[PDB]
């Protein structure tokens with residue numbers, strides 16, 4: 001068993017080599033996460049892709065031998081942690097709210113939000129700021145919060161809770177954060193009841209109250225939680241990671257600035273090259289599964305290392321090169337199969353508007369920190385930065 005925690009920040013900063021060595025030996029490996037969790041890592045583009053859509057790997061905890069704490073159990077009734085027929089019903093309930101068609105209608109508002117955030121950031125007295133604090137975090141939380149009716153003054157709280165989840169300074173920290181959030185969400189849900197809010201949460205509350213068969217009280221909390229959390233944490237990191245890749249690759253940045261029609265393709269490469277989801281969410285084999293000779297017992301935790309699939313030479317030639325014009329068709333940054341990120345259209349909209357706004361309004365935009373000064377999350381599931389200092393005055 002490889003102890004990833006023993007590799008320290010060197011692993012967090014650059015985990016790809018480790019993932020590659022493992023892929024060379026086999027598709028599945030038992031590892032010890034920095035958090036102390038003993039789990040399985042599935043590496044290799046082909047294998048990764050197959051497992052993601054393989055019904056033998058359930059996402060329903062009833063098939064997991066790992067116990068759910070009280071706090072975790074309260075939020076566990078969501079589409080992501082479910083298999084059909086439950087998953088099918090939960091997702092269909094809100095699928096229409098997130099199609100590209102619907103999401104496109106949000107462009108004017110997303111533009112407003114970005115414009116305002118950029119206006120505030122560029123007013124910095126010394127032409128310096130942290131992109132994470134000034135844009136990466138604020139944008140996604142604002143968008144999903146307006147959709148789900150989370151009052152603006154309560155938004156800063158999710159960042160605190162997210163930090164407690166991502167890089168918990170203590171196991172209990174994560175749990176306390178989950179209980180707080182769960183309580184906040186239940187109260188918010190309550191405050192919506194009876195009122196005629198036009199936001200999605202209010203709509204969901206109504207649906208739940210009118211027909212508990214379509215959405216039980218527990219599935220209601222589960223939905224509020226997954227949509228709000230998955231609704232911004234990864235987007236925040238895509239924006240920061242992507243802008244970091246771009247600004248740290250002079251020729252790619254110059255290429256994009258020279259032909260902004262390459263913007264959409266650049267965002268795709270950011271997803272492929274430095275996607276926010278290093279490893280997919282927990283999967284549990286219903287029955288023992290044999291992967292090219294290795295047998296993962298039923299009930300064990302399995303993480304499909306998307307980060308490694310994206311560095312597989314066979315699918316992405318010269319994988320370590322950040323190439324905005326590269327062919328990225330079929331990458332797994334948004335997953336694969338029935339769980340394919342329901343927020344992909346929205347994420348792409350947010351990321352594209354943010355990156356375009358920074359380039360078009362900040363011609364002298366540059367990094368204001370050195371690689372060694374950057375702090376990456378050790379969690380094998382999250383690829384992200386603690387902060388991203390930038391400047392725009394040469």
Ligand code: HEM
Pocket residue numbers: 052079080081091098144226227230231232234235236238275276277280281282332333334335336338339340341342343344346347348
């Ligand atoms: C650029 C950022 C994004 C990335 C890379 C991302 C990535 C992913 C991935 C890889 C999965 C599936 C993981 C697995 O199979 O275990 C997923 C699921 C999900 N994501 Fe995202 N996501 C992003 C943005 C969003 C946004 C904006 C929302 C907001 C609606 C969202 C909502 C969800 C939900 C609700 C699921 C569950 C889908 C299901 O189980 O059917 N995601 N996301």
